[PDB]
Amino acid sequence: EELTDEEKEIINRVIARAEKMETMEQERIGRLVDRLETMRKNVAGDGVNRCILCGEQLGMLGSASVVCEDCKKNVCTKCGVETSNNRPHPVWLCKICLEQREVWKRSGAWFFKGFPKQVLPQPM
């Protein structure tokens, strides 16, 4: 490597205001993640005979049903969202997985396939 006079002083500043931005980013993401967990805790069904979200039975009870492309469980058309692009046979998503995707995108986790930790401290 090499030495570094006050350069560190010039760099640590950038670092400092970058770490402050990281704190706020954790709060923005934190809220999104927490809201999602709450939704998960409210699952009342099993996804087999009774819808995974609400818990109402499916079948001859007059409740239409579909399978969610992401969690593979059965969801009623009420707790489900028909997604559609430019191709027939659209995929369905239960409300929780739809929000899951929104979180995976807005937080950047879709990139790292998870939440990473960039610990770049300041060289005193």
């Binding site: 490597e1 090499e2 350069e7 010039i10 760099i11 950038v14 970058a18 931005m21 706020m24 980013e25 709060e27 923005r28 809220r31 492309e69 992401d70 995929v91 995707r101 995976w104 995108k105 807005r106 950047g108 879709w110 990139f111 790292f112 990473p116 960039q118 770049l120």
Partner: protein, 177 residues
């Protein structure tokens, strides 16, 4: 939680003096300065844009090209979603270095990382030493998109960042089934 949907981290890398910072100051504040103040390590700017029906906050990092700050600048690669690898169209060496920076990116960054090869200073057609056909040819060989632009004469610069952003957006959209 502020007013935006996504936040893309972008790094601009390449040999010293190729015009990385200028490219930034022109996109952020729209200001060119013939002066040359080599960047100390790293620095960044934030800019929110509205594109593809989404509010996107861009955290654009400007890295030092000198081999001196390699370790500190490479440390910030792993967080990047997109790179702008530029060289001077009037400097053979900076263009010869591209292959290396490409390696540098493969090593310290994730896989989805999108890369755009930018040949800067296309205003200095008098001192041009690298032909468009060569840059393009290299870009195709590295799997990168190619743009020739100029910070000084605000040309093809916004179109560079906008292509980066859209490229990243499409990789996002592709990462979901």
């Amino acid at each position: 939680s502020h007013m935006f949907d996504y936040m893309f981290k972008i790094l601009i890398i390449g040999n010293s003096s190729v015009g990385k910072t200028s490219f930034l100051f022109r996109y952020a504040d729209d200001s060119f300065t013939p002066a040359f103040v080599s960047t100390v390590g790293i620095d960044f700017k934030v800019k929110t844009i509205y594109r593809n029906d989404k509010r996107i906050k861009l955290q654009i990092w400007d890295t030092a090209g000198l081999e001196r700050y390699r370790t500190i600048t490479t440390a910030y690669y792993r967080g990047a979603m997109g790179f702008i690898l530029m060289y001077d169209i009037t400097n053979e060496e900076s263009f010869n270095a591209v292959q290396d920076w490409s390696t540098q990116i493969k090593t310290y960054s994730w896989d989805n990382a999108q890369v755009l090869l930018v040949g800067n200073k296309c205003d200095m057609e008098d001192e041009r030493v690298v032909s468009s056909e060569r840059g393009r040819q290299l870009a195709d060989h590295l799997g990168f998109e190619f743009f020739e632009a100029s910070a000084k004469d605000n040309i093809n610069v916004k179109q560079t960042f906008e292509r980066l952003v859209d490229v990243i957006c499409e990789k996002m959209s592709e990462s979901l089934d």
